[PDB]
Design a protein around this ligand. Sequence first.
Ligand SMILES: [Mg+2]
Ligand SMILES: [Mg+2]
Ligand SMILES: [Zn+2]
Ligand SMILES: [Zn+2]
Ligand SMILES: [Zn+2]
Ligand SMILES: [Zn+2]
Lengths: 444, 444
Amino acid sequence: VLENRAAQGNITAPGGARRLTGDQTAALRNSLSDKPAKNIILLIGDGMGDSEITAARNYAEGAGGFFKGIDALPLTGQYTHYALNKKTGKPDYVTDSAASATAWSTGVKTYNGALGVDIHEKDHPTILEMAKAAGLATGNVSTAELQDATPAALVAHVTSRKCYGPSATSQKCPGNALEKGGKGSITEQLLNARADVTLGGGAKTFAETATAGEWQGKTLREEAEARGYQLVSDAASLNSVTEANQQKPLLGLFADGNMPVRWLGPKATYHGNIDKPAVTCTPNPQRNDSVPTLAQMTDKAIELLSKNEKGFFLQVEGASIDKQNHAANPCGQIGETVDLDEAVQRALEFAKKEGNTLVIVTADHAHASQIVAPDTKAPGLTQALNTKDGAVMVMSYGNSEEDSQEHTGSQLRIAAYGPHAANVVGLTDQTDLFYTMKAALGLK
Amino acid sequence: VLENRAAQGNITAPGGARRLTGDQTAALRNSLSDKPAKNIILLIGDGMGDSEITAARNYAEGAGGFFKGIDALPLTGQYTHYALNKKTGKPDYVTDSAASATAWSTGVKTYNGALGVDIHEKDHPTILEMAKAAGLATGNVSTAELQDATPAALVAHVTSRKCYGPSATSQKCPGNALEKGGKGSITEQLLNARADVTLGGGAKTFAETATAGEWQGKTLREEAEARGYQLVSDAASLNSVTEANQQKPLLGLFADGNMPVRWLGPKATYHGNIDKPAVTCTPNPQRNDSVPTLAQMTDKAIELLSKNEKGFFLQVEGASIDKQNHAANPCGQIGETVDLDEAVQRALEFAKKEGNTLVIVTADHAHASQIVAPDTKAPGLTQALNTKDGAVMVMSYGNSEEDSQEHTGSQLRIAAYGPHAANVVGLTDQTDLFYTMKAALGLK
Ligand SMILES: [Mg+2]
Ligand SMILES: [Mg+2]
Ligand SMILES: [Zn+2]
Ligand SMILES: [Zn+2]
Ligand SMILES: [Zn+2]
Ligand SMILES: [Zn+2]
């Protein structure tokens, strides 16, 4: 169990590239605890497989460097995230964001596109719901629309991830439609779930009006306010919040859709590593200072949530690693991984200080990006990048002839720190995570 | 630290896909020992990243299944394997088989193509040479030609991995050429190294005659005989060997080049998943019954090597996983992964009984193969396969327009069992592996 895993010295010399400063046995033995966790912070890098982590480290910290957040969790393993074919019930080797999120928040596999329901379309309780029932404080933060699959899986039970608001739900999820006697759209179910802290983008869906029930005729935003929610829309106002609980829950909407990415860089192109010059990422001119970063939202949530004496459960998502991966944009993809690392550092610092906090960092599924040789002649989209090492790294996206690059089914890294973290070691399934968090919290 | 990691029941039901049957904190604790290791068995799946492991498991055991050998090692982590640019000494993000093999066997990073030498072309002792010097028995087994990079790295110190025999060395490694005062070609250095057990393919090069020294004019095969080596060339003759030591060293040459692959299947093609039907692998008909499998060679090696009271170091390589990956042949690649799992099972079975044996399973670098959705329209080479689940899995090779698919730089899985296995957990470097073995054996 080391806090520093960077290369020891001169990487060209014997022992210079080593990351271990000594024997781990004693340290690792000391980090194994089966005492219950008071809190749980689950950080999800959407589409962040081992390849994505490696590319981001190579670029930002150098090959021999190390993410002070992402790479600092002592207990590691690899987990499977295959989904299920709805019709046959047989495995579907490459999952989407909805079925995977449903797996760790519910403990049951499902079909791609499903949120909080099994292949029979039957609802199952999420870890957030259970935590809330036990009296723990709950938080849900993401850089994507709050209706997007990852954050939505914790608070909604819908047959199609496309059922954002009333208008789409009536069409695509008629059985879940409020008018038709259902629990409602994703946004309505989010409002009903009432987590203590909810922060992200997706403000545009709150402009729709409820078609039935108590708050019928009033936009979803008006209903939020009528229900006692504190709504903040920028960094300044989030900062001014001093409490969030069942009486005054916090809801932050920092963008119409997804929050802007941190870095700017060109899109990878065919033969881009050979016909285009190497690129150096730069800050995104379109992201405003008033827009809080993932680390800021994470820190604020930990502060408000930690006021609960029974404990808290918090899920944090670095959403756009996946989205920029689909877009074949190395700079956007890497910047979103660096952003997540900052949020992980905030989580770990708190966990180390508090001492009864289980911190887990993983991804919902693997993705397209691959690190290939500089002179590679590939059929897909490529791009050469100038790294922190002063060397060129080429990234490749070669699994789709369409505009969007696709997910991949490879098992990927899961890492943890704190009480019950041993349950992440070795090979496990994404559904085991649900059970690991449920038992750690004694949420049974 | 469980031995069974298969899905517990109905994967469509709540908790049915779980691989864990309980808390593993206590089990993991007991798995942690820093007592000295008497023996070390290092198994390398050439080019076997997490993607390769997942694809093969999905096909052979089903998504919810598990490799009784490969997936059964309790302590897990991810390690980096970047090489170095010979000129600049800066990292080269994608290593070849020679630079990576040199890193774990020597403890120093080097340039692509180098064996046993650093970037200054200065050689360093290998873990096998250090084991011999300490009095331990040594074994080197592989399914590739014995001159190939992975097995050769343990016994040779050459500036270019292409220096197989006398002829190639004269023009590509003149400073190593015997007639120029060098230590000799890879094969001559292997003969000089005199490991107790050396099994693999590559008989072709033993047909070359030395150009200088005490055995000039004689083929390298004659030199081996002249130096006291027991030469075996099929499974029956291998089985007859009762002892292998410094006076009676064993040299098995089971093929002219690489040993034949276990499974046959067609090569992936452009739009092969949508143009051609799903394939089902079959055993390789052209594979002679008398050619030993990797598990048979591994088993026989353990038997002979364990006669040494001081202990033994054994490296086992499933070489063709990489070669079939380069060839974009899913069935060849998967079959070679299944083949390595059998060898891992023999290693683990021995280790559990013996109790002072450190077993490590990992790869030298990542590769091209990716698991994509069935309806994927990719720019590279694809193929649909019928898995054990009766479902279709599509594999993609999309990082090269040349005849050979390429390695990738992603960090990958390293797993271990036994004394000192804890040094494999968390993020480490491929060079740390050298030190982990050196310390476990007390060779320092
Ligand atoms: Mg997401
Ligand atoms: Mg090899
Ligand atoms: Zn996703
Ligand atoms: Zn995605
Ligand atoms: Zn290799
Ligand atoms: Zn290769």
